[PDB]
Symmetry: C2
Subunit: 54 residues, 2 copies
């Protein structure tokens, strides 16, 4: 009976919430990795600029 559908729809909503949470987590991890390398390339660029100071 309709309890099957209710249980199925409940599980699907949970699956979607989890997929959305996983997408959020991946974006956060991507931003953290990009921030790390942005910081290292910024460091490299600054270091090159400082060389010219006599």
């Amino acid at each position: 009976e309709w309890d099957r559908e209710i249980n199925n729809y409940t599980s699907l909503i949970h699956s979607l919430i989890e997929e959305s949470q996983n997408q959020q987590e991946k974006l956060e991890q991507e931003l953290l990795e990009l921030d790390k390398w942005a910081s290292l390339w910024n460091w490299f660029n600054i270091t090159n600029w400082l060389w010219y100071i006599k």
Copy 2:
């Protein structure tokens, strides 16, 4: 950039909030339907 990526995680959070509210509404429906089912069963086994 700053404003654009800001909106993407916000979009994800908005989606999750909507799905959470859909679950709570579905739970209310489940409660209503279960009440009918139990009343019906008790009537038939009385």
